[PDB]
Amino acid sequence: LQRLHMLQISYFRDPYHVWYQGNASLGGHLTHVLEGPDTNTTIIQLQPLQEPESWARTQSGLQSYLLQFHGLVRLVHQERTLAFPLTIRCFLGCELPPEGSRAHVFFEVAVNGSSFVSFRPERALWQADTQVTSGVVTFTLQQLNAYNRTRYELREFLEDTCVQYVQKHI
Numbered sequence: 001l002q003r004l005h006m007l008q009i010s011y012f013r014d015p016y017h018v019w020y021q022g023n024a025s026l027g028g029h030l031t032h033v034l035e036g037p038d039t040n041t042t043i044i045q046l047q048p049l050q051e052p053e054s055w056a057r058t059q060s061g062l063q064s065y066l067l068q069f070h071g072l073v074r075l076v077h078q079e080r081t082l083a084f085p086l087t088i089r090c091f092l093g094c095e096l097p098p099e100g101s102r103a104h105v106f107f108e109v110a111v112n113g114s115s116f117v118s119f120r121p122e123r124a125l126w127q128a129d130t131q132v133t134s135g136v137v138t139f140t141l142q143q144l145n146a147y148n149r150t151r152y153e154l155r156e157f158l159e160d161t162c163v164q165y166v167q168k169h170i
């Protein structure tokens with residue numbers, strides 16, 4: 001199993017307070033941890049897979065991701081009103097299938113334990129995973145599918161960064 005899986009659980013008590021609990025596993029082994037309130041997040045490699053400077057850049061990218069993740073949640077609230085508290089789960093990663101000619105990548109999002117939206121990475125597009133249409137789901141997808149961040153930068157993170165990471169460290 002040549003893969004890197006990442007799990008991020010975000011607990012929002014309201015738009016302005018989020019508590020993060022996350023971790024990543026490479027080849028089936030725990031390798032990273034995400035922990036703490038938005039005001040002081042700990043992001044660490046459990047193994048020094050990356051050198052200090054390299055790690056410093058990856059860490060910075062994760063920090064910027066969280067900042068925009070939180071930003072999007074506040075915008076959806078601002079525009080469509082969300083019912084707090086709420087918990088969001090992001091499960092994403094990449095795998096080099098044993099008999100594949102290409103990496104399999106994914107990013108799925110659940111809200112309060114139910115399917116909400118998921119990324120179709122190769123086309124960098126988001127889809128609803130819920131059975132019914134909702135102002136919240138629709139507006140969220142509109143934002144996710146609008147900007148170059150929530151689309152192309154994420155596609156690059158999964159298809160290129162994650163895959164290069166697995167190829168180098170596994």
Ligand SMILES: CCCCCCCCCCCCCCCCCCCC(=O)O[C@H](COC(=O)CCCCCCCCCCCCCC)COP(=O)(O)OCCN
Nearest residue numbers: 006008022023024032034061062065069153154156157165
């Ligand atoms: C590379 C291997 C690294 C391995 C070690 C990492 C593990 C750390 C600890 C484990 C914790 C798990 C949580 C980490 C998951 C986050 C993924 C990181 C994303 C990231 O760095 O990408 C940035 C892009 O930002 C964005 O894409 C911003 C988009 C924000 C919104 C996302 C939407 C989903 C949620 C929907 C919310 C709806 C709410 C309404 C109810 C720039 O990345 P880059 O520097 O590589 O550049 C690539 C392009 N060049």
Ligand SMILES: *[C@@H]1O[C@H](CO)[C@@H](O[C@@H]2O[C@H](CO)[C@@H](O)[C@H](O)[C@H]2NC(C)=O)[C@H](O)[C@H]1NC(C)=O
Nearest residue numbers: 004005006007022023024025026029030031032
């Ligand atoms: C991140 O850590 C969580 C919590 O330990 C892992 O979830 C556990 O996974 C094992 C094996 O799949 C299950 O038997 C446990 O019941 C899970 N516990 C919880 C809290 O749900 C999770 O697999 C880890 N994910 C990554 C990508 O590292």
Ligand SMILES: *[C@@H]1O[C@H](CO)[C@@H](O[C@@H]2O[C@H](CO)[C@@H](O)[C@H](O)[C@H]2NC(C)=O)[C@H](O)[C@H]1NC(C)=O
Nearest residue numbers: 013081082083084085086087111112113114136
């Ligand atoms: C996510 O789940 C939580 C339940 O843990 C929901 O919070 C409850 O919301 C109802 C309706 O407003 C209130 O009667 C309860 O007082 C809330 N519980 C707590 C602990 O405060 C929340 O509404 C859900 N959010 C979404 C978007 O589904």
Ligand SMILES: *[C@H]1O[C@H](CO)[C@@H](O[C@H]2O[C@H](CO)[C@@H](O)[C@H](O)[C@H]2NC(C)=O)[C@H](O)[C@H]1NC(C)=O
Nearest residue numbers: 033034035036037038039040041042043044063
């Ligand atoms: C939260 O993050 C860490 C702890 O998770 C804090 O780091 C320091 O906190 C105190 C500073 O006065 C020290 O007493 C701790 O020993 C030290 N922790 C270690 C061992 O690194 C940090 O200050 C908090 N948030 C920030 C970045 O200010």
